[PDB]
Design a protein around this nucleic acid. Structure first.
Lengths: 99, 93, 82, 108, 99, 82, 109, 95
DNA sequence: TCGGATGTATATATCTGACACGTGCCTGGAGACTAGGGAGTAATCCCCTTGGCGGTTAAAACGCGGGGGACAGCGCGTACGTGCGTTTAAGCGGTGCTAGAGCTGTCTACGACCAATTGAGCGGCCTCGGCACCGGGATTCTCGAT
DNA sequence: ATCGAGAATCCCGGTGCCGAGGCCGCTCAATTGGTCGTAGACAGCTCTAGCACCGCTTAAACGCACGTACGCGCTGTCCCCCGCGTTTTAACCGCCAAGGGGATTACTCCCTAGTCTCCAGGCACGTGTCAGATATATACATCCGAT
């Protein structure tokens, strides 16, 4: 029968691969469409510089990576290895975004 | 001898205008003075930055309006903008 | 560009963002949660960016508007001006 | 408004318009200061003061008092959802906290 | 045999009693001595206004009460009711004081 | 005042500060830990307060120095001036 | 030391003393600006720049490169203990993340 | 017609880089980041000095205000070394 | 389900000290005017934003088998809560002294301001060496088999 | 414990492009030199409030004993995420084209700074009295061992 890794090996391999790099991890066109949709419920007939959408993407990705680090800390605190929504909620509450 | 300025008599006028029968202690008035000073400096600093970004050298009333839109949360911002607009419109006319 | 683009933030993308954060295992309900926490964050920044754009009487959202909107929330960003 | 009296009375306010003008001119915020900026700022400051004072007066009446103390300002601020977002990083002296017990700790 | 409450009743009674009040909870002279000792390893022969020591005490007590709220949140997250040093450590790390 | 005054922040005082925070049960190793934390916080504020006092060429630490030192750390305090 | 030349050169710096003077003077910070404030500020800015650039150059040479990129600035900043405290709320674009795996997640015996 | 000119700190950052590492170059995005860093720190120090001169009812920002702002803003050893460097520069300029 | 026993809310007298209000006055705000440059407005140019094909192929979506991790339950034993008796030092009042904060007057050296001048720094060219990429081979974790 | 097969990642050499580094022309911002008015350095005086001491009452900290509820470790089930193969969708890249609106320049006018005079609002100080803190006595709610 063919080769097969055990659950948890490819996960660590991807952790190393993506902590070693600096690329952008969300696709560009879907994010640009999301940004335009939000902004157009704020004001109609707007235009965006490309640098503006790139800056928004950098900020969003940095935010989400920090939040996932804090979530992993909480999940380990509860003696687990799987992150769950209650970990995100506790991180955002202690951090100061849900008061 | 020196004299120090505060916002005590104006806070008291507002209080006797909204609650005609209650008074205010002294520590509460100290807290209210600190609140007024804090909000003044927040709004003024934001308006200064707004006038600097756009290469202007004058803080007009729309700098203050945009600073209020940036600093306060939603319905607070709406009511404060309406009050300020009404005050300026009554002042010029 | 009107309706339902938050599902363009796919599940592999959230999994990559979690791997860069050092996460080994992910629960199946995380994705619907992350598309919320993101949509709020974005909405706070754009709302400020547009507020700057209307002040300069412009109709184009410049990168400096985004840099100022982020600096105002305590998230200074280096590399796009400022 | 044509009446040439004190500017606070002309604009319709209780807060001082001239003192705010002087504080804006001598505070190193810009090189010039328009004529309608102190009026706007005085009106905004008066509105926010009236909001907080009304909530605090309600909180004081709810405790059978005829006088506001820092505890009532703390209660009025923490119990409003927007004044708590405007003053979330502020400490009121002699204010205490809001009564709050986590539901897991109560006897079952 | 004499009367006796069960463990957990007087604790809730004190929680209510101290959340209802606004007094200062640390003694004044010990805190003033601590403040003077720290400041005198920063600079010798200093004097303090009484308002200065009172402000320092208010700030310190507010800080510690907030930290204990966050610690209780962590302890409940781990499915406990007792707070431990690892809860304080997790709260101060997620909060931004231990990075 | 010279030596070992942090043991003057007794254990009952920490139980009271924890009860106001809503804590029902406390572990016997908390107290030590808490003292450590407290000291750090204090050392960050006083170090700034004295820095203001030296600038005005004074030998008395005023309450405004403490209010400024706290404001520059994101912990604004109402009721002592400013 | 007296001089008739550019002030940055008599002060001993490679940073504009006159431009910093004009920026302090036209920036609405105070009504007047002393003569020794731009010199001090230029010297402090040059020190901090030299510190960061040295650490980043070490990080670039540790990867067999002859050129600094944002990844090296990110590494040099996060791997110092004081530059990480001065720039703790800052995001470097295209900078990435320090490699760090929690010890509980690694495989065991 | 002409396009307006925009100033930056590129040539000075490059002089410092060629002083420290005599044979290393710098890319363009890294130089953008260095410009943002210099501007950020300038505005932090200048704003702190402005507030510090306003508290004491002064009209002038001197080297003493800048030194105290540096003592307030930077961490320990950074503060000690930056204060030594600024003092040495001002002394060399004056003498 | 239930009568103690303990703690907490409620009702009245009373007594002080802080809040609210009046008075003098002095300094900051208002009235009137002049002068100059900041900003509003019109016109023009050309950069860069948006919209549209068409192809290729990297990545997303879907289904499947199974192993490992989440979670519930049970048992033990140490550590924390509660209550009591003893010890310690905080808190309060009053006395007394002196350091140093705060204010006023004088004068001088420092920074703003203005006009002339000239070189440092910026925009545009452009070229070659560092870095990205291809591919082939070596090595090094990983895992099922004993 | 071990060894061998199979993916995965590092290493080494060759090929090529495009952006970093350096030159040049030129405009405008920094430098030089002089004048002037006022911010601040400094001396002197006053008098507030910070520090040190002393005695007394009693509230809170401390030490200790007992027991119970909770932390923590172990076991067992089961379901739900992970890894992998196959198919499908749409991102990405290069190109073409049009035009909106950002950016710059020229002109004018009207709005704000600056100066001087005048006067009344707000601040420091004094003083009376009533809201609130406290002592005391009940009344009621809550908790707990006993059924």
């Amino acid at each position: 029968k063919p080769h097969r890794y055990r659950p948890g090996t490819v996960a660590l391999r991807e952790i190393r691969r993506y902590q070693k790099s600096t690329e952008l991890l969300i696709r560009k066109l879907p994010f640009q469409r999301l940004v335009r949709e939000i902004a157009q419920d704020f004001k109609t007939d707007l235009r965006f510089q490309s640098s503006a959408v790139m800056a928004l993407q950098e900020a969003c990705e940095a935010y989400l990576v920090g939040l996932f680090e804090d979530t992993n800390l909480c999940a380990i605190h509860a003696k687990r290895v799987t992150i769950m929504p209650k970990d995100i909620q506790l991180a955002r509450r202690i951090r100061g975004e849900r008061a | 001898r020196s004299r120090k300025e505060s916002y005590s008599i104006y806070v008291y006028k507002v209080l006797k205008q909204v609650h005609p029968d209650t008074g205010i202690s002294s520590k509460a008035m100290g807290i209210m003075n600190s609140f007024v000073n804090d909000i003044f400096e927040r709004i003024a600093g934001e308006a200064s930055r707004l006038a600097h970004y756009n290469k202007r050298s004058t803080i007009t009333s729309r700098e203050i309006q945009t600073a209020v839109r940036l600093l306060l949360p939603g319905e607070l911002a709406k009511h404060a903008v309406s009050e300020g607009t009404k005050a300026v419109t009554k002042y010029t006319s | 560009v009107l309706r339902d683009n938050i599902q363009g933030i796919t599940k592999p993308a959230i999994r990559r963002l979690a791997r860069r954060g050092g996460v080994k295992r992910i629960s199946g309900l995380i994705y619907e949660e992350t598309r919320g926490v993101l949509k709020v964050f974005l909405e706070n920044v754009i709302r400020d960016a547009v507020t700057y754009t209307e002040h300069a009487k412009r109709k184009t959202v410049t990168a400096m508007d985004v840099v100022y909107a982020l600096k105002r929330q305590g998230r200074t960003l280096y590399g796009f001006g400022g | 408004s044509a009446k040439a009296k004190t500017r606070s009375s002309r604009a319709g306010l209780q807060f001082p318009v001239g003192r705010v003008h002087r504080l804006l001119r001598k505070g190193n915020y810009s090189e010039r200061v328009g004529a309608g900026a102190p009026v706007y700022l005085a009106a905004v400051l008066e509105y926010l003061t009236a909001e907080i004072l009304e909530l605090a007066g309600n909180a004081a009446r709810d405790n059978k008092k005829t006088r506001i103390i820092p505890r009532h300002l703390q209660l009025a601020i923490r119990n409003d959802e927007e004044l708590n977002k405007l003053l979330g990083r502020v400490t009121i002296a002699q204010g205490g906290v809001l009564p709050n017990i986590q539901a897991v700790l109560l006897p079952k």
